[PDB]
Protein backbone atom coordinates (compact mmCIF):
# COMPACT_ATOMS: atom_id res chain seq x y z
CA UNK A 1 0.00 0.00 0.00
CA UNK A 2 0.85 3.67 -0.26
CA UNK A 3 2.55 5.48 2.60
CA UNK A 4 1.98 9.16 3.41
CA UNK A 5 3.16 9.66 6.96
CA UNK A 6 3.99 12.95 8.60
CA UNK A 7 7.70 12.71 7.72
CA UNK A 8 7.34 10.78 4.46
CA UNK A 9 9.87 11.76 1.76
CA UNK A 10 11.89 13.80 4.28
CA UNK A 11 15.00 11.60 4.00
CA UNK A 12 17.27 14.34 2.65
CA UNK A 13 15.14 17.31 3.69
CA UNK A 14 15.65 16.75 7.42
CA UNK A 15 19.31 15.68 7.23
CA UNK A 16 21.98 17.47 9.24
CA UNK A 17 24.10 19.37 6.68
CA UNK A 18 27.13 17.07 6.46
CA UNK A 19 29.83 17.81 9.06
CA UNK A 20 27.29 20.02 10.89
CA UNK A 21 25.60 17.41 13.07
CA UNK A 22 25.28 17.48 16.84
CA UNK A 23 24.35 20.22 19.28
CA UNK A 24 22.67 23.42 18.14
CA UNK A 25 24.83 26.47 18.76
CA UNK A 26 23.60 28.92 21.37
CA UNK A 27 22.88 31.82 19.00
CA UNK A 28 19.79 29.94 17.79
CA UNK A 29 18.38 30.13 21.32
CA UNK A 30 19.74 33.64 21.86
CA UNK A 31 17.77 35.08 18.94
CA UNK A 32 14.69 37.02 20.04
CA UNK A 33 11.47 36.79 18.04
CA UNK A 34 8.69 39.35 18.26
CA UNK A 35 5.15 39.27 16.93
CA UNK A 36 5.41 40.57 13.38
CA UNK A 37 8.92 39.26 12.70
CA UNK A 38 9.46 37.53 9.36
CA UNK A 39 11.08 34.10 9.68
CA UNK A 40 12.25 31.38 7.29
CA UNK A 41 11.33 27.83 8.26
CA UNK A 42 14.03 25.16 8.03
CA UNK A 43 13.56 22.11 10.22
CA UNK A 44 16.47 20.87 12.32
CA UNK A 45 16.26 17.08 12.14
CA UNK A 46 18.02 16.77 15.51
CA UNK A 47 15.17 18.61 17.28
CA UNK A 48 12.20 16.29 16.83
CA UNK A 49 9.87 18.45 18.94
CA UNK A 50 8.14 21.54 17.60
CA UNK A 51 9.13 20.44 14.11
CA UNK A 52 7.37 21.86 11.05
CA UNK A 53 5.73 19.62 8.51
CA UNK A 54 7.77 19.11 5.35
CA UNK A 55 5.44 21.39 3.38
CA UNK A 56 6.67 24.42 5.33
CA UNK A 57 10.38 23.68 4.88
CA UNK A 58 11.63 26.70 2.98
CA UNK A 59 8.48 28.76 3.57
CA UNK A 60 8.65 32.24 5.06
CA UNK A 61 6.02 33.47 7.48
CA UNK A 62 5.17 36.04 10.14
CA UNK A 63 5.37 35.41 13.88
CA UNK A 64 2.00 35.86 15.59
CA UNK A 65 2.65 34.18 18.95
CA UNK A 66 5.62 33.86 21.31
CA UNK A 67 5.79 31.04 23.87
CA UNK A 68 8.43 29.64 26.21
CA UNK A 69 10.47 27.69 23.66
CA UNK A 70 8.56 28.30 20.43
CA UNK A 71 6.85 30.86 18.23
CA UNK A 72 3.64 30.75 16.24
CA UNK A 73 4.16 31.45 12.54
CA UNK A 74 1.49 32.50 10.03
CA UNK A 75 1.85 30.86 6.62
CA UNK A 76 -0.33 31.26 3.54
CA UNK A 77 -0.77 27.78 2.07
CA UNK A 78 -2.07 27.23 -1.45
CA UNK A 79 -5.04 24.86 -1.11
CA UNK A 80 -7.10 24.28 -4.23
CA UNK A 81 -7.52 27.62 -6.00
CA UNK A 82 -6.96 29.93 -3.01
CA UNK A 83 -4.74 30.54 0.00
CA UNK A 84 -5.61 29.38 3.51
CA UNK A 85 -4.05 30.77 6.67
CA UNK A 86 -2.05 28.21 8.65
CA UNK A 87 -0.67 28.72 12.16
CA UNK A 88 2.40 26.64 13.00
CA UNK A 89 3.82 26.16 16.50
CA UNK A 90 7.55 25.87 15.83
CA UNK A 91 10.39 25.63 18.31
CA UNK A 92 13.03 28.27 17.66
CA UNK A 93 15.54 25.70 16.40
CA UNK A 94 13.45 25.35 13.22
CA UNK A 95 13.25 29.06 12.34
CA UNK A 96 15.60 31.97 11.75
CA UNK A 97 15.10 35.68 11.18
CA UNK A 98 14.40 36.28 7.51
CA UNK A 99 16.60 38.69 5.54
CA UNK A 100 13.89 39.00 2.88
CA UNK A 101 13.15 42.55 4.05
CA UNK A 102 16.54 43.87 5.20
CA UNK A 103 17.32 45.28 1.76
CA UNK A 104 13.99 47.11 1.85
CA UNK A 105 14.70 48.37 5.39
CA UNK A 106 18.12 49.78 4.53
CA UNK A 107 16.60 51.20 1.35
CA UNK A 108 13.96 52.97 3.45
CA UNK A 109 16.65 54.36 5.75
CA UNK A 110 18.78 55.51 2.81
CA UNK A 111 15.71 56.99 1.10
CA UNK A 112 14.90 59.00 4.22
CA UNK A 113 18.50 60.25 4.31
CA UNK A 114 18.48 61.08 0.59
CA UNK A 115 15.16 62.93 0.87
CA UNK A 116 16.47 64.92 3.84
CA UNK A 117 19.63 65.89 1.95
CA UNK A 118 17.53 66.74 -1.12
CA UNK A 119 15.20 69.02 0.84
CA UNK A 120 18.19 70.64 2.53
CA UNK A 121 20.16 71.18 -0.71
CA UNK A 122 17.86 71.59 -3.72
CA UNK A 123 15.35 69.67 -5.87
CA UNK A 124 16.18 66.12 -7.01
CA UNK A 125 15.08 62.82 -5.51
CA UNK A 126 15.26 59.70 -7.76
CA UNK A 127 14.14 57.45 -4.91
CA UNK A 128 12.70 54.53 -6.91
CA UNK A 129 14.94 51.64 -7.84
CA UNK A 130 15.63 51.11 -11.52
CA UNK A 131 16.34 47.93 -13.47
CA UNK A 132 19.76 47.45 -15.01
CA UNK A 133 19.96 49.88 -17.89
CA UNK A 134 21.40 49.42 -21.38
CA UNK A 135 25.08 50.32 -21.46
CA UNK A 136 26.11 53.80 -22.54
CA UNK A 137 28.58 54.39 -25.34
CA UNK A 138 32.26 53.80 -24.68
CA UNK A 139 35.51 54.10 -26.61
CA UNK A 140 37.68 50.98 -26.58
CA UNK A 141 41.39 51.63 -27.05
CA UNK A 142 43.81 49.36 -28.90
CA UNK A 143 46.97 50.72 -27.20
CA UNK A 144 48.57 47.52 -25.99
CA UNK A 145 45.31 45.77 -26.91
CA UNK A 146 45.53 45.21 -30.67
CA UNK A 147 42.77 42.73 -31.58
CA UNK A 148 43.98 39.14 -31.75
CA UNK A 149 42.45 37.05 -34.52
CA UNK A 150 40.99 33.69 -33.51
CA UNK A 151 39.85 30.89 -35.78
CA UNK A 152 37.83 27.74 -35.05
CA UNK A 153 40.10 24.80 -34.29
CA UNK A 154 40.24 21.62 -36.38
CA UNK A 155 38.76 18.47 -34.92
CA UNK A 156 41.04 16.08 -33.05
CA UNK A 157 40.57 13.25 -30.58
CA UNK A 158 43.09 13.69 -27.69
CA UNK A 159 41.97 10.39 -26.19
Amino acid sequence: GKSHGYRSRTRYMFQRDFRKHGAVHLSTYLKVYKVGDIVDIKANGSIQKGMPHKFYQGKTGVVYNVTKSSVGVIINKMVGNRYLEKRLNLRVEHIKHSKCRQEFLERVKANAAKRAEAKAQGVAVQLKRQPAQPRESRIVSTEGNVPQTLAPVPYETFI
Binding site: N65, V66, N76, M78, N81, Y83, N89
Partner: peptide, 23 residues
Amino acid sequence: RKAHRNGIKKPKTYKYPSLKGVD
Protein backbone atom coordinates in the same frame (compact mmCIF):
# COMPACT_ATOMS: atom_id res chain seq x y z
CA ARG B 1 -6.40 25.43 -15.55
CA LYS B 2 -9.51 25.01 -13.39
CA ALA B 3 -7.75 26.72 -10.48
CA HIS B 4 -6.71 29.70 -12.60
CA ARG B 5 -10.11 30.17 -14.25
CA ASN B 6 -11.20 31.95 -11.07
CA GLY B 7 -7.55 32.45 -10.21
CA ILE B 8 -5.36 31.80 -7.21
CA LYS B 9 -6.63 34.54 -4.90
CA LYS B 10 -4.23 36.05 -2.39
CA PRO B 11 -5.69 35.84 1.14
CA LYS B 12 -7.01 39.39 1.53
CA THR B 13 -4.82 40.73 4.33
CA TYR B 14 -6.44 42.81 7.08
CA LYS B 15 -5.12 45.25 9.61
CA TYR B 16 -5.63 43.95 13.14
CA PRO B 17 -5.35 40.19 12.55
CA SER B 18 -7.14 37.80 14.86
CA LEU B 19 -5.58 36.73 18.17
CA LYS B 20 -6.71 33.11 17.88
CA GLY B 21 -3.54 31.29 18.86
CA VAL B 22 -1.98 33.95 21.08
CA ASP B 23 -0.81 32.87 24.53
